[PDB]
């Protein structure tokens, strides 16, 4: 999603360890400029894609249903 949020890239003109240090610090800062928006826009929803052939399912279903249990078994062997 990095295409969504804003974050300005730093660069240096000389090419010395000082410029590199300053780049690292400016990135430290722009990272917070990112986190602010990540927080204020984090939506609700799921975490693992509901394709149980790839990511394991929740344990309640793993225990009640059957196909989800088979997929659990296969994923984990």
């Amino acid at each position: 999603v990095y295409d969504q949020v804003e974050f300005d890239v730093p660069i240096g003109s000389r090419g010395d360890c000082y410029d590199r240090y300053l780049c690292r610090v400016e990135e430290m800062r722009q990272s917070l400029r990112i986190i602010e928006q990540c927080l204020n826009k984090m939506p609700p929803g799921e975490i693992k894609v509901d394709d149980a052939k790839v990511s394991p399912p929740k344990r309640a279903e793993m225990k009640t249903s059957m196909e989800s249990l088979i997929h659990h078994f296969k994923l984990y062997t």
């Binding site: 509901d50 394709d51 149980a52 052939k53 399912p57 279903e61 225990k63 249903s65 059957m66 196909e67 989800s68 249990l69 088979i70 997929h71 078994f73 296969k74 062997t77």
Partner: protein, 686 residues
């Protein structure tokens, strides 16, 4: 005669009376399966083999439908995938959540087909069902809230084992599969429904709860419990055997093997031998090392020679040991190498592979037209032969007949009687069977060494050769076809007879020797009383009940899982094992033992390696390195003319194979004597 198809555009040529599924196989695309097994009949219960047929709307079942010229098939299309999704939703509606407990956890066809072709969850917010569990035997642990009702067990039983006791009882979800009573489904072939039931409903009780597949290192080997040559998969775990499985050989065992060979994997853990055990001053048996044992035996052999040295071999011993013993007693100038088994040898004996074998490949029993049995219960000795006979009598309208007591078989037939005089009666042609034979072509006459093991054996064999000459002059056949057939039980026997031994103990009864080498011979045909009192006997084996307690020295060898030895069935086939495990404690391989013994006694052989010994076999007998290749022969007419010279004649008392109660099927060799499972089998039978 051919017929055409265009799968996915791809074209195919097949025969009529064919199946969509066999066509898709010819192409490569595997089609799902629940109620199909190429070695069975057909049905349409499961309903997972569905496909789409272009130019026709309705789906079909590729396990029954015969392909019509011009059809374009579609396997991975929309309707097909939807059918499979629905069908598996249905199945898994009720299959309980015993996947972990289920010993068939990582091999479950249903697991795999759900993970791949099925769906990702259940839309079943309802209740399930269960069913009572049955006791069916001390081998086949039955859970029956898992049977998807495929009917594989039912068809397999009603066709192969002729049992006719299993079946379905009810209609609707309440259906069950299993006898209506607490009967026991014990049989020489009970023990393949395990491999056939894709689910963990009919599990094996011994293996159960012990391990899982993926952990295993599946090595490959063969069987020795009988002289058939059942290719086998031996499963290991952290350096130990855990289970045995069949291995597909389209000729010999064809994906089926015997209760004995698959449940005698425990006898390799009880009553074993791990250290050189030598007599003491009192006579007890104390442990000691190879240094002592071989120093002793070689210092004694250096003094003994002539014909006072005698080697006996039993079953379950390898051609390598046999050849090494032969060459050693040769360099020592002795010839009393014999086997615990008898084989009437007068006339020709052991000089032509056309004799003492199955001149006819076991396969040819499918193409034969009439079969005759001479005093044998193959149901107990070499059953898979009996299963080929079963399928033959079932399919190609066969006619079978036998000589011997009235035996409990799977089919019905004509019973001649119980006196081999019947054989000469036939050779004259004064018995309806004479006309039956002279009419029908490609007959076959099999004779089990269980009778030759009698006393008047060579005479009955001579009468049989006479009968054979008669039948051959009656009907029109060539040596390209064969008539006579011999069927042993012990494995090492054929390798010995090909290495040129004395198949008997007549030599021993004639020349009481001093030193007695004996290998794997837990048969007790010999003991201390049949010999002088100052003898010296060396038991080289891997199990002690009979031969060891009567021993001066006891050496351990190895079993059929730990020595890369050859072996030969009753049709000249040459099968080698593969070392699946390493033996216990001090025990070593037999040919190594013997090369060391020779090097000590100053008789050094040129054999430092299994491969050098393979070349030695290539010299001695060539067809023992021809792995998986039979060697036909045609000089049986000469052998029969030779035997005709002899005038010995049979006795009058009847004959019997000494295995009638299935009880006798178990407890043959050390392994089936030892296993604490065979005990349960027997006590359940009785």
């Amino acid at each position: 005669n051919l017929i055409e198809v265009f799968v996915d555009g791809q074209s195919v040529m097949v025969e009529p009376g064919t199946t969509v599924l066999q066509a898709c196989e010819k192409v490569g695309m595997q089609i799902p399966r629940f109620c199909y097994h190429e070695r069975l009949s057909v049905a349409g219960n499961c309903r997972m083999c569905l496909v789409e047929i272009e130019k026709a709307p309705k789906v079909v079942a590729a396990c029954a439908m015969p392909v019509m010229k011009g059809w374009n098939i579609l396997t991975n299309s929309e309707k097909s995938k939807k059918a499979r999704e629905g069908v598996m939703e249905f199945l898994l509606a009720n299959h309980p959540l015993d996947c972990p407990i289920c010993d068939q956890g990582g091999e479950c066809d249903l697991q795999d087909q759900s993970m791949m072709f099925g769906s990702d969850r259940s839309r079943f917010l309802e209740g399930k069902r269960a069913v009572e569990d049955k006791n069916i035997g001390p081998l086949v642990k039955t859970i029956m809230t898992r049977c998807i009702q495929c009917t594989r067990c039912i068809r397999f039983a009603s066709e192969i084992a002729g049992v006719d006791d299993l079946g379905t009882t009810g209609r609707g979800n309440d259906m069950q599969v299993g006898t209506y009573i607490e009967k026991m489904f014990m049989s020489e072939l009970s023990g393949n429904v395990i491999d056939i039931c894709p689910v963990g409903a009919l599990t094996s009780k011994p293996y159960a709860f012990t391990a899982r597949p993926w952990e295993t290192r599946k090595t490959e080997s063969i069987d020795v419990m009988d002289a058939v040559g059942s290719n086998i998969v031996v499963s290991t775990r952290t350096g130990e055997v855990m289970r045995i499985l069949p291995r597909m050989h389209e000729d010999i065992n064809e994906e089926w093997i015997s209760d004995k060979t698959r449940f005698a994997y425990d006898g390799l853990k009880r009553q074993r031998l791990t250290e050189p055990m030598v007599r003491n001053e009192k006579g007890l048996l104390t442990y000691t090392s190879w240094e002592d044992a071989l120093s002793r035996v070689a210092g004694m052999l250096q003094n003994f020679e002539g014909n006072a040295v005698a080697a006996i071999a039993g079953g379950l011993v390898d051609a390598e040991a046999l050849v090494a013993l032969k060459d050693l007693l040769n360099k020592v100038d002795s010839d009393n190498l014999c086997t615990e088994e008898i084989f009437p040898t007068e006339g020709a004996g052991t000089d032509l592979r056309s004799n003492y074998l199955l001149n006819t490949t076991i396969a040819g029993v499918e193409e034969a037209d009439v079969v005759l049995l001479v005093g044998t219960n193959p149901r107990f000795e070499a059953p898979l032969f009996n299963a080929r006979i079963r399928k033959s009598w079932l399919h190609n309208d066969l006619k079978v007949a036998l000589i011997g007591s009235p035996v409990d078989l799977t089919y019905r037939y004509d019973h001649l009687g119980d006196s081999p005089k019947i054989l000469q009666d036939i050779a004259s042609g004064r018995h309806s069977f004479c006309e039956v034979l002279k009419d029908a072509k490609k007959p076959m006459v099999v004779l089990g060494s269980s009778a030759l093991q009698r006393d008047d054996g060579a005479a009955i064999l001579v009468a049989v050769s006479n009968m054979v000459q008669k039948i051959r002059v009656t009907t029109g056949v060539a040596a390209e076809w064969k008539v006579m057939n011999i069927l042993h039980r012990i494995a090492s026997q054929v390798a010995a007879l090909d290495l040129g031994y004395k198949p008997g103990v007549e030599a021993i009864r004639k020349n009481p020797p001093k030193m007695l080498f004996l290998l794997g011979a837990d048969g007790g045909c010999i003991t201390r009383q049949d010999l002088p009192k100052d003898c010296f006997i060396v038991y080289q084996g891997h199990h002690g009940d009979v031969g060891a307690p009567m021993a001066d020295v006891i050496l351990p060898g190895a079993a059929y899982t730990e020595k890369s030895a050859t072996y030969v069935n009753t049709e000249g086939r040459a099968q080698q094992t593969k070392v699946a495990v390493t033996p216990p404690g001090l025990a070593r391989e037999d040919w190594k033992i013997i090369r060391a013994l020779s090097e000590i006694a100053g008789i050094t052989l040129p054999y430092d390696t299994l491969d050098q010994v393979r070349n030695r076999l290539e010299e001695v007998s060539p067809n023992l390195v021809r792995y998986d290749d039979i060697e036909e022969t045609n000089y049986f007419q000469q052998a029969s003319e030779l035997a005709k010279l002899v005038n010995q004649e049979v006795l009058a008392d009847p004959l019997v194979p000494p295995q009638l109660t299935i009880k006798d099927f178990y407890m043959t060799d050390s392994i089936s004597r030892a296993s604490q499972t065979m005990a349960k089998c027997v006590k359940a039978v009785t």
